[PDB]
Amino acid sequence: GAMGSMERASLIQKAKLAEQAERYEDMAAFMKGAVEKGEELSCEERNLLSVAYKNVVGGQRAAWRVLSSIEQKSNEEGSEEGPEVREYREKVETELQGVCDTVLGLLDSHLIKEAGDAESRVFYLKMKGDYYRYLAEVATGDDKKRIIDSARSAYQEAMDISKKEMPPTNPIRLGLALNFSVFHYEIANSPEEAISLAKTTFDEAMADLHTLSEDSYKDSTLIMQLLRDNLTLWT
């Protein structure tokens, strides 16, 4: 590994620096090296990892969607014919799949099996689900169903742990629920399940708000607002 000669703490520091500079590819490389040091990650470190790879793969997904729309247009009725569009969409798609495989390899070697506390275990299983979902977004062949089911399984195990070990307003539980609802709506062709999950999540969080101190849950009300945005869009 290119980072095997840098101190873990130095990798964390440089990941924060890269975050400040919005150099998310560097951030991802640094946090990958940190993970490969072999020690479990603190709450702050998991956040850095997730943020870095989320931004990298988000850019990749947006580019893939631009190119896929162009490709679809190029295969309509009356559209003038070469292979360039397909080739470049395949290039972006292959790079995207590489990043997703890298993150899943990190989770499987060996973040999840050493994750014993609810916070971290749910975090990692949500991330596994997220990246299998990103793989599902572009899958078209004999593996689509298995990729979708891997995403579902990871999300479901995370849900079972969060419901049992976390309060309804925990930001991790809320983000997991948001993304699992988006899985149901956009991947699993199950919009009614997506709506039901979003509504139940929002209602339970709403009912638990009264136990929280004010300045200590900005992210939770933020994510409840995202749940409400999705509900407004879908109904």
């Binding site: 993304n179 945005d229 869009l233």
Partner: peptide
């Protein structure tokens, strides 16, 4: 645009 986090 589906909201995810």
């Amino acid at each position: 645009q589906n909201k995810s986090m």
